[PDB]
Amino acid sequence: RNKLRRQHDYDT
Amino acid sequence: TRFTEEYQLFEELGKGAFSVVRRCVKVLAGQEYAAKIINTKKLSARDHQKLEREARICRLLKHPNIVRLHDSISEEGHHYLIFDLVTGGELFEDIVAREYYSEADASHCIQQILEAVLHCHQMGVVHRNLKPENLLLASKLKGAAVKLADFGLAIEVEGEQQAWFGFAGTPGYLSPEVLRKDPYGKPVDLWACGVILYILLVGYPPFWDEDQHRLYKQIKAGAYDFPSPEWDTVTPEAKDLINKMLTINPSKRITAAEALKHPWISHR
Ligand SMILES: CCCCCCCNC(=O)OC[C@@H]1O[C@H](OC)[C@H](O)[C@@H](O)[C@H]1O
Numbered sequence A: 001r002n003k004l005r006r007q008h009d010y011d012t
Numbered sequence B: 001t002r003f004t005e006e007y008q009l010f011e012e013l014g015k016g017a018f019s020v021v022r023r024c025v026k027v028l029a030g031q032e033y034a035a036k037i038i039n040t041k042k043l044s045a046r047d048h049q050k051l052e053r054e055a056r057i058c059r060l061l062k063h064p065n066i067v068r069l070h071d072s073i074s075e076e077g078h079h080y081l082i083f084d085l086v087t088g089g090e091l092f093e094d095i096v097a098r099e100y101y102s103e104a105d106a107s108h109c110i111q112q113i114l115e116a117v118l119h120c121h122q123m124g125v126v127h128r129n130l131k132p133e134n135l136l137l138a139s140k141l142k143g144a145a146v147k148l149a150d151f152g153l154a155i156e157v158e159g160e161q162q163a164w165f166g167f168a169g170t171p172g173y174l175s176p177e178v179l180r181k182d183p184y185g186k187p188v189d190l191w192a193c194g195v196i197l198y199i200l201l202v203g204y205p206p207f208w209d210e211d212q213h214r215l216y217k218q219i220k221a222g223a224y225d226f227p228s229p230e231w232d233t234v235t236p237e238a239k240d241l242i243n244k245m246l247t248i249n250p251s252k253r254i255t256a257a258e259a260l261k262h263p264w265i266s267h268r
Helices: B001-006 B045-058 B093-096 B103-122 B174-179 B188-203 B211-219 B234-243 B256-260
Strands: B007-014 B017-024 B032-039 B069-074 B078-083 B134-137 B146-148
Touching: B001 B007, B001 B069, B001 B078, B007 B032, B045 B069, B045 B078, B078 B134, B093 B134, B093 B188, B103 B146, B103 B188, B103 B256, B174 B188, B174 B211, B188 B234, B188 B256
Parallel strands: none
Antiparallel strands: B007 B017, B017 B032, B032 B078, B069 B078, B134 B146
């Protein structure tokens, strides 16, 4: 079951 | 030396690759701001281009639902982007605490987000990194405005002309066309709006996997559903707008303008 989580931004 | 003369630094609000965000006070005016502080010592000329792009894009955008840039200040070793102080915290944290929004609250919320996106698109700006952490509430007082922030990954586009502009964004919110490494433009932002509206209504995302390669497969295939019990009482008009935003084919994906005319937003 999918949890809401903070995620890192990428530039490559 | 305008920043060192006029402003005092207080606590950290966020972090970046070469940067920090801190509350500051313009001392004589008695007014508080959020400063992005970039260390510019031996920055690459490309990274200088990116910094000037963020400042330029931020100066272009004048909208109630977008964080205002007040000043861009170049000192020796440090650059300062001085933005409005927003004290309501990330939309992310509000969604986790309330768990989910009512349809009327989610609609009012996504309506503001789409108006900000519409403005961006009309000014030839693509954000590329919409998500709940990048959307800030204007105050802690319930009913506070949502403000779009962090244009660090934003690009300038010429009308409806698309290209491979590079791989940038956040995994859960990435568009199929970015993951395929195909040309893209404004629609990447409407895909991310679809992901956010889904989170707004049930408080968990439509795409998640421990395995990032499996995550990207799920996204590229538009493999989302509306599980029980959380979707049991959600209207089909809400499912419909999400469907239209989470359309794989970016030409057939609903635009910001079209989304603001969707009955689920406009007929209340
Ligand atoms: C990142 C470059 C844009 C800075 C704009 C700051 C707007 N004013 C602003 O006062 O930002 C608020 C904080 O700033 C960060 O998010 C932007 C924190 O992650 C959040 O916790 C948020 O509460």
